[PDB]
Design a protein around this motif. Structure first.
Motif, PDB file in Angstrom:
ATOM      1  N   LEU A 240       0.789  -1.228   0.000  1.00  0.00           N
ATOM      2  CA  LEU A 240       0.000   0.000   0.000  1.00  0.00           C
ATOM      3  C   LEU A 240       0.828   1.289   0.000  1.00  0.00           C
ATOM      4  O   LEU A 240       0.501   2.240  -0.711  1.00  0.00           O
ATOM      5  CB  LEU A 240      -0.969   0.006   1.185  1.00  0.00           C
ATOM      6  N   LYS A 244      -0.348   3.581  -3.189  1.00  0.00           N
ATOM      7  CA  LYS A 244      -1.198   4.705  -2.809  1.00  0.00           C
ATOM      8  C   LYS A 244      -0.631   6.038  -3.276  1.00  0.00           C
ATOM      9  O   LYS A 244      -1.301   7.065  -3.190  1.00  0.00           O
ATOM     10  CB  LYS A 244      -1.415   4.744  -1.291  1.00  0.00           C
ATOM     11  N   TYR A 249      -4.897   5.676  -7.929  1.00  0.00           N
ATOM     12  CA  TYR A 249      -5.226   4.720  -6.879  1.00  0.00           C
ATOM     13  C   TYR A 249      -6.655   4.956  -6.399  1.00  0.00           C
ATOM     14  O   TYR A 249      -7.011   6.069  -6.020  1.00  0.00           O
ATOM     15  CB  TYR A 249      -4.263   4.875  -5.700  1.00  0.00           C
TER      16      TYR A 249
END
Ligand SMILES: CC(=O)N[C@@H]1[C@@H](O)[C@H](O[C@@H]2O[C@H](CO)[C@@H](O[C@@H]3O[C@H](CO)[C@@H](O[C@@H]4O[C@H](CO)[C@@H](O)[C@H](O)[C@H]4NC(C)=O)[C@H](O)[C@H]3NC(C)=O)[C@H](O)[C@H]2NC(C)=O)[C@@H](CO)O[C@H]1O
Length: 273
Positions: A240, A244, A249
């Motif tokens: 992540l 991100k 995203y």
């Protein structure tokens, strides 16, 4: 971002109303309308939840509205791993589009499978059959948005890029949300101690297609797929933080509701998504 969840393939995973009241999901894909095209009478399969015959599944409309009032978007997912779905021609694409419009969207039908509720859009989960006309289906469905209410278009391609079945459709730039499946595909999924393949794949998807938002599709549990499962801790501390950073995203997608409950995956990653 938010979490997209697939619901409908296991009667023990709870009702659609229960699913949305968890407050963990932002999008719900109803799986699956696995039979259509080539003259076949379209048929939906919701495992043990309900039998579509004699309006046995019209009870789902209550769950659909319950989700929508909470701001959750609900899509009808076409395809899946099992089914004789396909498109024989461009005319077939138009026929299926008109069918979907009258039975699941803003059209009119005296036999709407899931009730009178109006779904937010259509999800493309095509993984076998024909590789043609899916881009036409997307165009015909999108054209219906001009009548007032927007018809959302989402897709769930396999992580190998470009996708053999949805590649052309995604090139139209008509899709709002795309949740790439990073499992059941060795070259672009997670492997113990190796996140290179999945990250490399993610960068190819986020820079190659024109879509609203792209999501990281994963299995909610080790038993949810043949391979590709990623432990919560690994996703949170290693994957992540990287993905991100992309402006495209959108969040994470999980298969499926049933396995998410047993493994408690979304409950463990919710705040980090
Ligand atoms: C987005 C996408 O493409 N996702 C892929 C997944 O589709 C795939 O997971 C597998 O998906 C298939 C459907 O395509 C699913 O099959 C269903 O299995 C259930 C359980 O056996 C069946 O439910 C029974 O149905 C009968 C009659 O309909 C009922 O009488 C009975 O009560 C039901 N049982 C229960 C417990 O509800 C469904 O009928 C059947 N669906 C179809 C269309 O035949 C598999 O179970 C899914 N497998 C898993 C592990 O979840 C996934 C695999 O990893 O890959 C994704 O890419």
């Amino acid at each position: 971002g938010g979490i997209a969840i697939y619901w409908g393939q296991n009667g023990n995973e709870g009702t659609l109303t229960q699913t949305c009241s968890t407050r963990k999901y932002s999008y719900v894909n109803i799986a699956f309308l696995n039979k259509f095209g080539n003259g076949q009478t379209p048929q939906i399969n919701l495992a043990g939840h309900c039998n579509p015959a004699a309006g046995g599944c019209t009870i789902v409309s209550n769950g659909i509205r319950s989700c929508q009032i909470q701001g959750i978007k609900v899509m009808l997912s076409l395809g899946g791993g099992i089914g004789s779905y396909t498109l024989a021609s461009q005319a077939d694409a138009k026929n299926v589009a008109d069918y979907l419009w009258n039975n699941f969207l803003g059209g009119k039908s005296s036999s709407r499978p899931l009730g009178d509720a109006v779904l937010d859009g259509i999800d493309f989960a095509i993984e076998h059959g024909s590789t043609l006309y899916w881009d036409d289906l997307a165009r015909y469905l999108s054209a219906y948005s001009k009548q007032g209410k927007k018809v959302y278009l989402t897709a769930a391609p396999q992580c190998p890029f470009p996708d053999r079945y949805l590649g052309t459709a995604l090139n139209t730039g008509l899709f709002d949300y795309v949740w790439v499946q990073f499992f059941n595909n060795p070259p672009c999924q997670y492997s113990s101690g190796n996140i290179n393949n999945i990250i490399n794949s993610w960068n190819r998807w986020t820079t190659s297609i024109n879509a609203g938002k792209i999501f990281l599709g994963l299995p909610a549990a080790p038993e949810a797929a043949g391979s590709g499962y990623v432990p919560p801790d690994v996703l949170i501390s290693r994957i992540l933080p990287e993905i991100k950073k992309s402006p495209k995203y959108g969040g994470v997608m999980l298969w499926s509701k049933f396995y998410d409950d047993k493994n408690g995956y979304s409950s463990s990653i919710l705040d980090s998504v």
